[PDB]
Write a protein that binds this ligand. Sequence first.
Ligand SMILES: C/C(=C\COP(=O)(O)OP(=O)(O)O)CC/C=C(\C)CNc1ccccc1
Ligand SMILES: [Mg+2]
Ligand SMILES: [Mg+2]
Ligand SMILES: [Mg+2]
Length: 536
Amino acid sequence: IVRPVADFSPSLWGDQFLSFSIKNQVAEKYAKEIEALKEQTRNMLLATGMKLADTLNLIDTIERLGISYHFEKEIDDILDQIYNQNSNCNDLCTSALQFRLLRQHGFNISPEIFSKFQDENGKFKESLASDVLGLLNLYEASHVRTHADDILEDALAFSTIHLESAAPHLKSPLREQVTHALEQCLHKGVPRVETRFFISSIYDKEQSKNNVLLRFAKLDFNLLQMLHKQELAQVSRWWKDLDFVTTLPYARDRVVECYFWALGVYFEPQYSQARVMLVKTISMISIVDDTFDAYGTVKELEAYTDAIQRWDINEIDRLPDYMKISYKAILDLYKDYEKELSSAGRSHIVCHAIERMKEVVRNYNVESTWFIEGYTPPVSEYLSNALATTTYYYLATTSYLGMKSATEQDFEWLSKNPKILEASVIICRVIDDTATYEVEKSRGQIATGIECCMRDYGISTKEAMAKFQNMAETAWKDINEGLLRPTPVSTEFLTPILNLARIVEVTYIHNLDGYTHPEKVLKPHIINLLVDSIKI
Ligand SMILES: C/C(=C\COP(=O)(O)OP(=O)(O)O)CC/C=C(\C)CNc1ccccc1
Ligand SMILES: [Mg+2]
Ligand SMILES: [Mg+2]
Ligand SMILES: [Mg+2]
């Protein structure tokens, strides 16, 4: 039994994360200052009689600075008051920001707030083309559209063309802020990634910056980063004591990138156990994926799939030796979770993630059977199988395991494949197929996603990759709609699903598999979030 040659890049990190010792001296210093700075900032938020535009800029600034999670209450109370007052008497900049902030927090503010900036056509008044700050906020706001916001259909295109035209002559740091927005809007970016950029490249270089907020943000980011580094060290050690690097060499060695993925789902300290649990799962399912996708014979993947279904160590003897390595590690991982959760009595909930992994595995095997047989399913049939293979139903479910507040009713909701969950699953699928179309139209895979879309609709690779990006746009509208109150579960359990969609957009920016090829895209992110501190 001779197998496809290993062709993956090795982890570019070595063991540079393997051992991080926190400096308690530094950490307690940072924390002590932050407490003072926090209250200073709380009082800024609670100041009486501010103008609407000042309030929205304050909240915007704090959120971009990455310190808003300290003021969920305060910030919500303020937006709720703003929402319930209906202020239709502002300019484009304030209006667009008001719109974006309220929408991001689930307040279904009407898009009619924009009617005053449009002609009798729904086309934005061209006279606004010289109002860069207005354009900039209209641009950002244009990305939180739901299906009901067709009024904003022109906003992205209008804002874009005029931001592009103005950028070269703007002063700094506004120029850099615009250029970066044009490349990566705020709403669909990874929060820590955007925050690092905002703090260092923009806010720190503003003539007008608030020094208390700047300092607060720098200290908080560097403090959490110490936590993240501990987390990664612990996970790196865990991955090293697994040694899949040598025993399962056919697979991608990307546990750092997996941690990046878990960090994107949530960064707050309260989600530390959840990150550690999540990243282990991400890492492990990545191995399973590579075993189906680049090593195991169909006969071998059958025994593997059945053994996953039966879920019981008595099945290892039925498996090839290298498959016993991954299989016992999988079963072990879940007994780990059961125990890690044992003290808070939340052990039972593990079977939700287990069942979702079984489901992923089932569809890995189908996918495999299609490739062997050379089957090109109709797009409907292809999606009904290829949605789960994103692993995203599964990761979403996993992400709840470590959240102390996650009740059974939450998992119950997530199991019914709610529309918000399905939308980010769709985004993952259509982006993965677009990026890795020419990756694996070379590796002999006649069963690619795009290849179904072409044979089915009688359309070219052009129209195929479009009609896919099409579904991505629809899905973002559904995500945005899914955040609106009344929410089906508490917002805390929606943000991970939204964050999962964000990470896919960011990793595959410019249409490249940034996970398999972390070099160009992911490595700079990883350096700025987990290697370099923000110099103070
Ligand atoms: C990275 C991987 C699948 C993508 O690689 P590939 O394009 O070869 O998959 P495919 O066979 O088309 O499903 C899943 C393992 C890593 C995880 C959980 C998070 N990252 C992720 C990235 C893209 C798709 C799904 C998930
Ligand atoms: Mg696969
Ligand atoms: Mg794969
Ligand atoms: Mg693919």
